[PDB]
């Protein structure tokens, strides 16, 4: 079928089609989401937690991501795969950011990268965008004047060239407006329902990590739990000599 | 509770306790299997397929594994985590193998490593074992005289110091004997029911990869499928403005 | 005979001589095109597809090109060999671009390099040109205001020093004008007939890749097919003991 | 359909099926030979001449080959791709040879490697073979006692583990015998008709390089010449304004 | 319980809560201070003396600190761990400073870094702060106009983004004012009692180094002396055969 | 006074003088033990736990030790400072071990190194010893035949050249004998009272880590606890404005 | 006694105390000058000649100096040791100069560095000075307008932060003035008697190199000659069997 | 005049000419000893003390020597310059030793190297000697059987190829014999008067280091003291305005 491209997300904002974005970190997962119809996959730095067990996204390195990106890229032939730039890889300036992004494309095989930041990151977004690298921006709300800054960021980020922007933990009201005020699609996560698209960490979306589903997350299943019995039953059958059988 | 150690596997062979080993490649998965009671986790090179999308286990590199090992090590505090040595990292001889294994322990944080091979690999197993590195052997059956070699390998491998050995695609009959003939535990996968323990790639065990469950694999669930709807439903709700709601 | 130099292309624009440029990626091919009279050879990044099987030109690296350039340079003693700068090697700025180009000349043995881009790349083109490195520009059309930009690019690029410019996927009408408006030769590919010169990927020109000849490509032969029988017949004769004979 | 594996070549020696091996050095060529049914492809060091223009095979480096191997591997999904080890990469001993071969498999994606040499190279062939790396041997005839050595080499090489052996410039008589005396398939090139299989440099097989077809080579076509007109005609049409037309 | 964050220090300045900061350089020490309730730990460059025996803080390198930081980070789960930047690692400018700080966070696991300097270092503090790296400033008094500069530094440093500032060897009077004039907390050491918080090198605080307690330091114990007998008694018991006993 | 040398330990075995060895990992600690009369200091890999918070001694690297050794060397001018070789740095063989040890002497400034292992490590001990590097051996007891091996190790190790040997977790009875059977001093830790000398991790010796003093350790003080109040009191006085006072 | 610091040189200019600076390049020499009371030692790049035999100061590298600096630093505990920056290590700009100087302090153990140059080097002097690195300037006279430039340099250099400045080959008259016009001490060598301090290459000062004592140098001895007999006599006694005697 | 070669030392042993060897570490010193007639110069690792202030010869590195060797080589055109191999550079075996020595010749410009050791070092001496590198051996006496070993070393060392051997701290009686028993010259230092030649550290020979002249050293002067006044007088004249005068 059709391979999602950035322009598709733009058309969808026009046609009013609200698309879904899911986070992915390996081949098998991506394969599933791809044959499930998910148009956009995010190899997020959130992998730091769900994949590597870091209690933050500060330690994860580019090298802990590129190999995962390659895997996701191979598993979702129809999805637009976005590679998230790790903390520290782009804050230095355009040159650094460009080198990092270039690695994600030439090596990781990603189609686009996600650069987190507000106005302070416009220069970087511009360089990449001008280099021909699709950039998905990521802005937030950090408490009044805060709402102003969020807006300034949303504007600056789009001006820089971002083909879309993620609004994380942004007051639904403010989000709604920004969404209507920007020409590019807005992807929300705890941003309210008024965003051109939505994004969730698949681990949360399918109950695969812990049990604490935050407010902005809707638990669409208990894939984690389902895996627990599968394992527990497997274990018992092994102990009970029931497995393997002869057909095995 | 109790952190599984190699001696436990030995005691279990004595008490006739058949234990289950599951493959794992990330923090979240390991966490689940750990709280599911799985005693031994294998960060297999099978990750080459299920994690990175390689159609073989030949290309995967040490660097594509170590970071995954670290994650698994963090997610399974009670399991005995075994790191699998990638193709090419130990065939050169003891020195190479030792360096590679040392990386998996000092860096990966693994408790033991899995070295695939027969007699030809005894020297390597001995060096590591003597260095204080727990080694899980891995022998197979490659078609008559074949059964002899498998036996020779099983013997040589144990002589070298392996604390356990994996029998993959080994005729149940031959396996049964070898199991009874060795002092160390035998972990099978398509080796028959007469092995001190069993091992499966969790992706297959829980139907997370493709649909072709081979003969030696028992599909204990459809975790993959379950994830497909979760994603599909999520997508539709996004399109239907049903998600996010206000509680989000 | 005569070794084509950049000034020749300029004279030809004056004399109204429409010259042909062919893509080349190895010694044997270049040798053929050279003794076939082709004046200009392009070791394009299109090699990413036809040579390495990448589905894009994003992954190909300088190192996957330089050795090919050297080969082409050795096979076409009379042609003006142009080396194409890979994605990511010049977007960072002049310094990067200069280093990359310098490698293609000092190492690759190329006579000139092709830098893809519009106004955004003028700075780079200027640095190289001033360094004494012949630069062939490459501009395109990306949909109204688009035609304006194409023009701006054509102008900026020439101002920067490009000895010629490639117009790819440019509306014949717009192309025609630009061609007449620029002092330097315009080389088209899907740009219409009104260009000082034409360029095609030899694989397409001679039907050596797939069967889908796009609109802008004219299939001058089925060299690929011809190779298929040669191989098939060879195979059968081998099977039929007809080859080798005794004269062999 | 079916992906050729080494055992297939063995079965064929049994069934008396004479198979054909063709040299290949890029994606497009491999694609053609693959859909032409060629079972085995050799990314030979002969590329030194036909690809890079070296007048010998002494200068070509591993790095000038690996990227070509990757391309060939991508173009022939059904063929058994063999990567030839460059001069100097294995003569030092097993350790060196193993490292080199490992690169060709893990990086190049090759299925097997070709190691040129006689008895003096048995140690290397053994190490690789034991490492799980399929090795295609390559022996020759260098003038009386010579025939003895060729035989000794044929024997030693097979003893070392080679799954097949290439006999180049070997007296048909001697070749015939060796072929009958070895358990593994013999692939000839100027070795006579009595070899389990045949191999030719595709450039010669299809008349793509020079015009001097040596005795052991049969010119199955003039693909090179066919390319010359295609180019010459293309050039003239460009000059004659006939190309591009409007359909372009 | 609660993990101290930078905002806590701000709240405390508001509530008038004077907090204590202690220097720490290893896991065991940090563990103690953590379970002793110390909110902020400083892996100081002072380690140069107390840890490595350098008579100055000029020679200590980043590598002699990062591993210590990791240890302290592991020992104080509830403390805000601040890593001090070594001499020479940030004076070159923002780029250098950013790279250094990034190492301390991504590798060292620190939560914040301490950058010593006045106005001259504002640019660096700004870059880090904007990058999302918490920076603790450090200003001093170097003899009239001196008091002016100290003030200028206090102002500039806070303007740059520092979440707090250390006043070392600053006239209590001047300190008092600066403390009242700044919005961010002031941490003193020989700065007088009018600072939002206090800091001491634990070695001095607990009499573990030398016997010369300077004026600004209050000796809260003789932990060093206590260790001397422990050692001396241990030694004598060993000599007296009293140790080990049988319970040992 | 007198700087302890290895021969001193030998004389002491003769005179029946039981000496005490203490572990040390920094300048200030070493200074204390030195002026406390401790003759031998061990910069152990036990630092992995007490210094860096690793739950094992497997991860610690040479680089996490050398800088500590330098510090200890500077703090104990009269002690014989022994540097412990980290896991993985000598198991490969003499060459590796020699390079590692050489670093500890030339860089770390150590006087001797400690190599853990039995017979399997004799070759390494011999190389270093012959190189002029004082080696302290380290053997253990790992459960019958075990006692035999311990003995074999004690013998082999001394034969190799070790100037002394550490017996850790060795049955007092067996230890007693070995001590009497060897010409070189035996240093015990959980080895019983019949050893030429004793060794303890200062953290345990002075109650600085946790509260679980194992059987073989005698808690000579609560230096850790003493540090807790010092810190707690310091904190309260800061909060109570009592500190700093004016004398400060 | 007292360790000379830069402020001492300033006080001395005030008290009118003319201090002497001597060049030094090794431990033994420095030890002598230190116990001889010399306050300032210069590890000059003049070492290029007297130490390494270069006929110029152009070839000497940082690495040929740092190890000498370390030696001098160890030999003169009371002197202010100044390390010279080698040709080419600071002319590129502040960044380069800062890195070089930082090596001399952190590695060499120097207290200050000497940067040769006039106005053109102010930027470098400023960066180092602001970094906390004491810089001794070095200006000269190169023939009218020359005297103006010397003055401009003297001014610029001091403005940049130099704690002192060397006037080499400067007309005594001009020197006298500059000395009176600057706030910082002036150290002369062939600059006349009106300088806050004097400096000479110890080799010349003590007649250790050649015999041609230039005008600005006063030969205070013939230490070189004295060494010649010592050697000659030693040689003869060896030949005469007089040495060694029995007391030897 | 004549440039001393190794054969000269041999002739001298024959003619009974007792030659003198002096240690040297810089250009100026070497120049003096050269024009003083000293035939052999030793760039000893004793430089560790006299040049760099190390209290041992354990820390000095090859890099702290090579540059000094180059200097000495330039200063003594007629002397046979011998470079010493630093601790750790040859104990690993021939390969290591050869590489190290090769650096001293090709880079340092030395004519020969000094390898310290007894029988244990014969292999190394043999490799170098066979490579064409003149090796000066160095054996000692370490207390009965000791005298036997010294002899064994003297024999082994000469057998290995040493063109001469240094006997340090060897009982004059034993020395006398060894001297008469060896075919190669013996150079003593505290070895008695019966050695083909003598060697002393010039610092001791001329009273340039400390005042404690050991038994085996004869103080031929007080060059150090002479330098002290030269410096002291220089200093006073500077202070007294007597220097510089006008002639300066
Ligand atoms: Mg992030
Ligand atoms: Mg495997
Ligand atoms: Mg391109
Ligand atoms: Mg060849
Ligand atoms: Mg500091
Ligand atoms: Mg240990
Ligand atoms: Mg200079
Ligand atoms: Mg020595």
Distance CA(E229)–CA(B107), nearest Å, equals 39
Chain F residues in contact with H58 (beta carbon < 8 A): 105-106
Distance CA(G197)–CA(G29), nearest Å, equals 21
C223 touches chain D (CB under 8 A): yes
One DSSP character per residue, chain C reads: -----HHHHHHHHHHT--EEEEE--SHHHHHHHHTTT--EEEE-TTHHHHTT--SSSSS--GGGTHHHHHHHHHH-TTSEEEEEPPTTSSTT-HHHHHHHHHHHHHTT--SEEEEE-SGGGHHHHHHHHHHT--EEEEEE----HHHHHHHHHHHHHHHHT-SEEEEES--HHHHHHHHHH-SS-EEEESS-S-SSEEEE-HHHHTT-S-S---TT------HHHHHHHHHHHHHHHHHTT-SS-S--
Q: Cα torsion at B33, B35, B36, B40 (round to 10°)?
A: 50
Q: Å resolution of this model?
A: 2.8
How many CA atoms lie within 13 Å of H223's alpha carbon, on the beta-carbon side? 27
Locate E95 and state its tokens: 């780029």
Distance CA(C70)–CA(C82), nearest Å, equals 11
| DSSP 8-class letter at F118 | S
Tell me whether residues G95 and E91 touch, CB distance under 8 A: no
F220 touches chain E (CB under 8 A): yes
| Total residue count of chain C as it appears in this document | 248
The β-bridge partners of A178 are none
Q: How was this structure determined?
A: X-ray
A130 touches chain C (CB under 8 A): yes
Q: How far is the CA of F214 from the centre of ligand 6 (A)?
A: 18
| Cross-chain CB nearest to F102 (options H88, H93, H120) | H88
State which H helix or E strand residue D99 sits in: helix D94-106
Give Cβ neighbours of residue H216 (< 8 Å, ≥ 6 apart): G244, G248, H169, H189, H190, H191
Query: What backbone torsions phi and psi does residue F42 show, to the nearest 5 degrees?
Result: -110, 110
Tell me whether residues E130 and A91 touch, CB distance under 8 A: yes
Catalytic residue from among B168, B173, B226, B247? B168
One DSSP character per residue, B70-133 reads: HHHHHH-TTSEEEEEPPTTSSTT-HHHHHHHHHHHHHTT--SEEEEE-SGGGHHHHHHHHHHT-
| Start-to-end C-alpha separation, chain B | 37
Chain D residues in contact with B93 (beta carbon < 8 A): 95
| DSSP 8-class letter at F117 | B
Which of A131, A169, G49 lies closest to C91, judged by CA? A131
The CB density around residue C19, as the number of other CB atoms within 10 Å, is: 22
**How far are the Cα atoms of F145, F170, G92 from residue F178, in angstroms, in the given order?**
15, 10, 66
One DSSP character per residue, chain E reads: -PPP-HHHHHHHHHHT--EEEEE--SHHHHHHHHTTT--EEEE-TTHHHHTT--SSSSS--GGGTHHHHHHHHHH-TTSEEEEEPPTTSSTT-HHHHHHHHHHHHHTT--SEEEEEBSGGGHHHHHHHHHHT--EEEEEE----HHHHHHHHHHHHHHHHT-SEEEEES--HHHHHHHHHH-SS-EEEESS-S-SSEEEE-HHHHTT-S-S---TT------HHHHHHHHHHHHHHHHHTT-SS-S--
How many CA atoms lie within 13 Å of A33's alpha carbon, on the beta-carbon side? 34
Chain E residues in contact with F64 (beta carbon < 8 A): 67
- Pick among G66, G73, G97, G105 to test the E interface (most E CBs inside 10 A): G105
Tell me whether residues A205 and B231 touch, CB distance under 8 A: yes
Provide the 3-class DSSP secondary structure of residue H226.
Answer: helix
Which of H47, H74, H44 lies closest to G48, judged by CA? H74
**Which residues constitute the domain of residue H243?**
1-248
Distance CA(G86)–CA(G63), nearest Å, equals 10
Chain B residues in contact with D94 (beta carbon < 8 A): 92
Q: Is F244 exposed, middle or buried (0-12, 13-18, 19+ CB in 10 A)?
A: buried
CB D202 within 8 A of CB D24: yes
CA angle A154, A160, A164 (to 5 degrees): 55
Q: Is H241 exposed, middle or buried (0-12, 13-18, 19+ CB in 10 A)?
A: exposed
Contacts with A, B 62-91, CB within 8 Å: 63-64, 67-68, 70-71, 74-75
**How far are the Cα atoms of A71, A81, E10 from residue A43, in angstroms, in the given order?**
10, 7, 36
The answer to whether D26 is a known ligand-binding residue is no
Query: What backbone torsions phi and psi does residue H23 show, to the nearest 5 degrees?
Result: -80, 145
Which of E108, E101, E146, E147 lies closest to E124, judged by CA? E101
B92 touches chain D (CB under 8 A): yes
Helices and strands counted in chain D (H then E): 10, 8
CA distance D57 to chain C (A): 14
Provide the 3-class DSSP secondary structure of residue A141.
Answer: coil
The residues whose Cβ lies within 5 A of ligand 3, an ion, are C 45, 57, 116
The answer to whether A226 is a known ligand-binding residue is no
CA distance E156 to chain F (A): 26
CA angle D26, D27, D33 (to 5 degrees): 90
Which of E23, E138, E128 lies closest to E69, judged by CA? E23
Provide the 3-class DSSP secondary structure of residue A224.
Answer: helix
Start-end of H helices in A93-188: 94-106, 122-131, 145-160, 172-181
Give Cβ neighbours of residue C145 (< 8 Å, ≥ 6 apart): none
CB D156 within 8 A of CB D118: yes
One DSSP character per residue, D108-129 reads: T--SEEEEEBSGGGHHHHHHHH
Which of D221, D203, D204, D222 lies closest to D213, judged by CA? D204
Q: Sign of dihedral through CA atoms G91, G92, G94, G96?
A: negative
CB G27 within 8 A of CB G74: yes
3-state secondary structure C85-110: CCCCCCCCCHHHHHHHHHHHHHCCCC
Distance CA(C16)–CA(D240), nearest Å, equals 11
Which of H48, H68, H66, H64 lies closest to H56, judged by CA? H48
E99 touches chain A (CB under 8 A): yes
Distance CA(F100)–CA(F107), nearest Å, equals 10
**How far are the Cα atoms of D66, E21, H229 from residue D48, in angstroms, in the given order?**
13, 68, 74
CB A184 within 8 A of CB A13: yes
Which sequence positions of G are flagged as catalytic?
168
Chains with at least 3 CB pairs less than 8 angstroms from chain F? B, E, H
CB H166 within 8 A of CB H114: yes
CATH number at residue B18: 3.20.20.60
How many CA atoms lie within 13 Å of C229's alpha carbon, on the beta-carbon side? 9
CB C161 within 8 A of CB C136: no
CA distance D112 to chain C (A): 19
What is the number of the ligand closest to the CA of B84?
A: 2
The CB density around residue G1, as the number of other CB atoms within 10 Å, is: 7
Give Cβ neighbours of residue A184 (< 8 Å, ≥ 6 apart): A10, A13, A158, A162, A163, A164, A165
F94 touches chain B (CB under 8 A): no
A92 touches chain C (CB under 8 A): no
Q: How far is the CA of F116 from the centre of ligand 6 (A)?
A: 6
Chains with at least 3 CB pairs less than 8 angstroms from chain A? B, C, E
| Cross-chain CB nearest to F226 (options E35, E226, E234) | E226
**How far are the Cα atoms of C223, D105, E65, E151, G105 from residue E91, in angstroms, in the given order?**
64, 48, 18, 21, 14
Distance CA(A175)–CA(A193), nearest Å, equals 9
Q: Sign of dihedral through CA atoms C25, C27, C28, C29?
A: positive
The CB density around residue A127, as the number of other CB atoms within 10 Å, is: 25
H3 touches chain G (CB under 8 A): no
In angstroms, how far is CA G59 from the centroid of its own chain? 18
Give Cβ neighbours of residue D27 (< 8 Å, ≥ 6 apart): C49, C50, C51, C52, C53, D71, D72, D74, D75
Locate A121 and state its tokens: 């990151």
Peptide bond into A58 cis (omega under 30): no
Chains with at least 3 CB pairs less than 8 angstroms from chain E? A, F, G
Which chain F residue shows the shortest CA-CA distance from E32?
F228
How many CA atoms lie within 13 Å of E39's alpha carbon, on the beta-carbon side? 21
The CB density around residue H109, as the number of other CB atoms within 10 Å, is: 16
| Cross-chain CB nearest to H190 (options G50, G53, G248) | G248
CB D192 within 8 A of CB D163: no
| DSSP 8-class letter at H121 | G
How many CA atoms lie within 13 Å of H55's alpha carbon, on the beta-carbon side? 5
The β-bridge partners of A200 are A22
Q: How far is the CA of D45 from the centre of ligand 4 (A)?
A: 6
The answer to whether D116 is a known ligand-binding residue is yes
F/H touch flag: 3 or more CB pairs below 8 Å: yes
Which chain G residue shows the shortest CA-CA distance from E96?
G95
| Total residue count of chain D as it appears in this document | 248
Provide the 3-class DSSP secondary structure of residue H166.
Answer: strand
The CB density around residue F212, as the number of other CB atoms within 10 Å, is: 7
How many domains are contained in chain F?
Answer: 1
Tell me whether residues G102 and E88 touch, CB distance under 8 A: yes
CB B104 within 8 A of CB B67: no
Catalytic residue from among H91, H168, H173, H237? H168
Give Cβ neighbours of residue A154 (< 8 Å, ≥ 6 apart): A139, A165, A167, A178, A181, A182, A186
CA distance H117 to chain G (A): 23
Q: How far is the CA of A44 from the centre of ligand 1 (A)?
A: 8
Tell me whether residues A215 and B75 touch, CB distance under 8 A: no
Q: How far is the CA of F36 from the centre of ligand 5 (A)?
A: 31
Q: How far is the CA of G117 from the centre of ligand 7 (A)?
A: 9
Distance CA(F97)–CA(F112), nearest Å, equals 13
Binding residues of B: 45-46, 84, 114, 116
Give Cβ neighbours of residue E189 (< 8 Å, ≥ 6 apart): E166, E167, E168, E169, E198, E199, E200, E216
Chain A residues in contact with B229 (beta carbon < 8 A): 36, 220-221
């Amino acid at each position: 079928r059709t391979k999602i491209r950035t322009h598709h997300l733009q058309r969808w904002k026009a046609d009013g089609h609200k698309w879904a974005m899911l986070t992915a970190y390996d081949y098998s997962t991506a394969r599933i989401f791809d044959e499930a119809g998910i148009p956009v996959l995010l190899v997020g730095d959130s992998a730091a937690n769900v994949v590597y067990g870091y209690d933050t996204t500060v330690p994860i390195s580019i090298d802990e991501l590129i190999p995962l990106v390659r895997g996701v890229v191979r598993g979702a032939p129809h999805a637009l795969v976005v590679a998230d730039l790790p903390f520290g890889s782009y804050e230095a300036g355009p040159t650094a950011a460009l080198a990092a992004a270039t690695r994600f494309l030439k090596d990781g095989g990603a189609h686009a990268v996600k650069l987190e930041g507000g106005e302070r990151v416009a220069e970087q977004i511009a360089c990449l965008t001008a280099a021909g690298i699709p950039v998905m921006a990521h802005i937030g709300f950090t408490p009044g004047d805060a709402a102003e800054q969020t807006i300034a960021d949303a504007i600056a980020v789009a001006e820089a060239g971002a083909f879309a922007v993620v609004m994380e933990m942004v007051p639904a009201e403010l989000a709604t407006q920004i969404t209507g005020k920007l020409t590019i699609p807005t992807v929300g996560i705890g941003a309210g329902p008024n965003c051109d698209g939505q994004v969730l960490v698949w681990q949360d979306m399918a109950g695969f990590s812990g049990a604490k589903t935050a407010r902005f997350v809707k638990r669409y299943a208990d894939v984690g739990g389902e895996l627990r019995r599968a394992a527990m039953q497997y274990a018992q059958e092994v102990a009970g000599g029931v497995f393997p059988a002869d057909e095995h």
